[PDB]
Scaffold this active site. Structure first.
Site, PDB file in Angstrom:
ATOM      1  N   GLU A  50       0.828  -1.206   0.000  1.00  0.00           N
ATOM      2  CA  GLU A  50       0.000   0.000   0.000  1.00  0.00           C
ATOM      3  C   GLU A  50       0.861   1.254   0.000  1.00  0.00           C
ATOM      4  OE1 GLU A  50      -1.900  -1.586   3.654  1.00  0.00           O
ATOM      5  OE2 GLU A  50      -3.743  -0.672   2.869  1.00  0.00           O
ATOM      6  N   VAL A  51       0.314   2.335  -0.548  1.00  0.00           N
ATOM      7  CA  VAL A  51       0.966   3.643  -0.499  1.00  0.00           C
ATOM      8  C   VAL A  51       0.067   4.590   0.230  1.00  0.00           C
ATOM      9  CG1 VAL A  51       1.920   5.560  -1.836  1.00  0.00           C
ATOM     10  CG2 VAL A  51       2.107   3.206  -2.676  1.00  0.00           C
ATOM     11  N   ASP A 160      10.216   0.654 -16.988  1.00  0.00           N
ATOM     12  CA  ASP A 160       8.760   0.643 -16.846  1.00  0.00           C
ATOM     13  C   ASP A 160       8.132   2.036 -16.943  1.00  0.00           C
ATOM     14  OD1 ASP A 160       6.405  -0.797 -16.597  1.00  0.00           O
ATOM     15  OD2 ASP A 160       6.481  -0.782 -14.413  1.00  0.00           O
TER      16      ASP A 160
HETATM   17  C1  LIG Z   1      -1.736   7.406  -6.466  1.00  0.00           C
HETATM   18  C2  LIG Z   1      -1.612   8.829  -6.079  1.00  0.00           C
HETATM   19  N1  LIG Z   1      -0.424   9.324  -5.732  1.00  0.00           N
HETATM   20  C3  LIG Z   1      -0.286  10.622  -5.391  1.00  0.00           C
HETATM   21  N2  LIG Z   1       0.975  11.215  -4.993  1.00  0.00           N
HETATM   22  C4  LIG Z   1       2.114  10.379  -4.874  1.00  0.00           C
HETATM   23  N3  LIG Z   1       3.277  10.832  -4.525  1.00  0.00           N
HETATM   24  C5  LIG Z   1       4.243   9.928  -4.448  1.00  0.00           C
HETATM   25  C6  LIG Z   1       3.808   8.642  -4.766  1.00  0.00           C
HETATM   26  C7  LIG Z   1       4.591   7.391  -4.812  1.00  0.00           C
HETATM   27  O1  LIG Z   1       4.117   6.361  -5.259  1.00  0.00           O
HETATM   28  N4  LIG Z   1       5.907   7.469  -4.303  1.00  0.00           N
HETATM   29  C8  LIG Z   1       6.753   6.285  -4.327  1.00  0.00           C
HETATM   30  C9  LIG Z   1       6.956   5.545  -3.155  1.00  0.00           C
HETATM   31  C10 LIG Z   1       6.274   5.974  -1.878  1.00  0.00           C
HETATM   32  C11 LIG Z   1       7.800   4.451  -3.180  1.00  0.00           C
HETATM   33  C12 LIG Z   1       8.426   4.119  -4.366  1.00  0.00           C
HETATM   34  C13 LIG Z   1       8.216   4.854  -5.536  1.00  0.00           C
HETATM   35  C14 LIG Z   1       7.376   5.946  -5.516  1.00  0.00           C
HETATM   36 CL1  LIG Z   1       7.131   6.888  -6.952  1.00  0.00          CL
HETATM   37  S1  LIG Z   1       2.122   8.643  -5.157  1.00  0.00           S
HETATM   38  C15 LIG Z   1      -1.412  11.455  -5.400  1.00  0.00           C
HETATM   39  C16 LIG Z   1      -2.631  10.892  -5.779  1.00  0.00           C
HETATM   40  N5  LIG Z   1      -3.832  11.723  -5.784  1.00  0.00           N
HETATM   41  C17 LIG Z   1      -4.999  10.954  -5.467  1.00  0.00           C
HETATM   42  C18 LIG Z   1      -6.219  11.726  -5.760  1.00  0.00           C
HETATM   43  N6  LIG Z   1      -6.134  12.996  -5.070  1.00  0.00           N
HETATM   44  C19 LIG Z   1      -6.429  13.154  -3.635  1.00  0.00           C
HETATM   45  C20 LIG Z   1      -7.755  13.869  -3.553  1.00  0.00           C
HETATM   46  O2  LIG Z   1      -8.733  13.148  -4.219  1.00  0.00           O
HETATM   47  C21 LIG Z   1      -5.051  13.821  -5.626  1.00  0.00           C
HETATM   48  C22 LIG Z   1      -3.738  13.115  -5.361  1.00  0.00           C
HETATM   49  N7  LIG Z   1      -2.691   9.596  -6.102  1.00  0.00           N
END
Ligand SMILES: Cc1nc(Nc2ncc(C(=O)Nc3c(C)cccc3Cl)s2)cc(N2CCN(CCO)CC2)n1
Ligand SMILES: [Cl-]
Ligand SMILES: [Cl-]
Length: 288
Positions: A50-51, A160
């Site tokens: 999960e993130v 990727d």
């Molecule tokens: C899927 C997603 N991620 C967002 N920002 C991220 N920042 C960094 C991310 C990431 O994965 N880091 C990472 C990690 C942690 C490990 C290895 C590699 C990596 Cl690259 S994901 C924003 C977003 N939104 C959803 C919808 N909204 C909310 C209101 O509704 C606006 C925003 N959705």
């Protein structure tokens, strides 16, 4: 039974520092993640885990934290997962790459903490429900090419590149992320190299061959998808034609001559003829 304390994961060979944070007491049963961050929302999930969007108790800033699902199955499983951190560290700091703040393992679980970005390009386009305006496309193409030039000049291949792995930022910018498949060419670890999403995969990979050019081709299909609002084929003649230097005139009639020309350079079937990220960024159209 007693529990090992959490420990930082890093391949920099630096002296082993042991984890600390406001709100964290290692004698408590709760994990470092639980004690050290305010969990705000879940951004994503999958078989990997999960993130989460979180706020750090250390500095009061927002971050993203990826947490694996279940403990390592064995030493090689652990090695393979931890290697994502080593790949990500090889990318370093770059304004068009998602920055890794820190990583740690605890109880067989791996945690990667990055800067918090906006949504993925996949999400954005899904929301948009149409082709992106070309002005937007150019800006994303440039930023992702800047990320690739940064990687490629160091002998790194991402493997990727796709909209799900590109994250938006303010003012029409974007950042390449997800370095879990990234490989350093011509060093150890050639045994652990694996191709990325088959929808975006370069043709040479069908014969087992790869190099930096594979990313340029994947980014080509990334830009085609978002610029034309096209569902890329998973296989068959449609998939194969995209690997043979052909563009469907239907979805692509709306493209400017300039953007079409650039996509053709990127989708060139022969990796030896395919344009490099550096050559593309030197085009007058990507130097506005
Ligand atoms: C899927 C997603 N991620 C967002 N920002 C991220 N920042 C960094 C991310 C990431 O994965 N880091 C990472 C990690 C942690 C490990 C290895 C590699 C990596 Cl690259 S994901 C924003 C977003 N939104 C959803 C919808 N909204 C909310 C209101 O509704 C606006 C925003 N959705
Ligand atoms: Cl946890
Ligand atoms: Cl194992």
């Amino acid at each position: 039974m007693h529990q090992l304390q959490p420990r930082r994961v890093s391949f920099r060979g630096e002296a082993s520092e042991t984890l600390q944070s406001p709100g964290y007491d290692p004698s408590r049963p709760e994990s470092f993640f639980q004690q050290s961050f305010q969990r705000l929302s879940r951004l994503g999930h999958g078989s990997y885990g999960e993130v989460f969007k979180v706020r750090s108790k250390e500095d009061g800033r927002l971050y993203a934290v990826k947490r694996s699902m279940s403990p390592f199955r064995g030493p090689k499983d652990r090695a393979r997962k931890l290697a994502e951190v080593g790949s990500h560290e090889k990318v370093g700091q770059h304004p068009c790459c998602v920055r890794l703040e820190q990583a740690w393992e605890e109880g067989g679980i791996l945690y990667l903490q990055t800067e918090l970005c906006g949504p993925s390009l996949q999400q954005h386009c899904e929301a948009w429900g149409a082709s992106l305006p070309e002005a937007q496309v150019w800006g994303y193409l440039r930023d992702t090419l800047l990320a690739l030039a940064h990687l490629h000049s160091q002998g790194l291949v991402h493997l990727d590149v796709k909209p799900a792995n590109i994250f938006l930022g303010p003012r029409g910018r974007c950042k390449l992320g997800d370095f879990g498949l990234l490989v350093e060419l011509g060093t150890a670890g050639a045994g652990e190299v694996q191709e990325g999403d088959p929808r975006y995969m370069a043709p040479e990979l069908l014969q087992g061959s790869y190099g930096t050019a594979a990313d340029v081709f994947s980014l080509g299909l990334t830009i085609l998808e978002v610029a034309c609002n096209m569902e890329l084929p998973h296989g068959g003649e449609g998939w194969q034609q995209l690997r043979q230097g052909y563009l469907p005139p239907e979805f692509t009639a709306g493209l400017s001559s300039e953007l079409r020309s650039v996509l053709v350079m990127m989708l060139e079937p022969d990796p030896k003829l395919r344009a490099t990220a550096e050559a593309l960024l030197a085009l007058p159209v990507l130097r506005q």
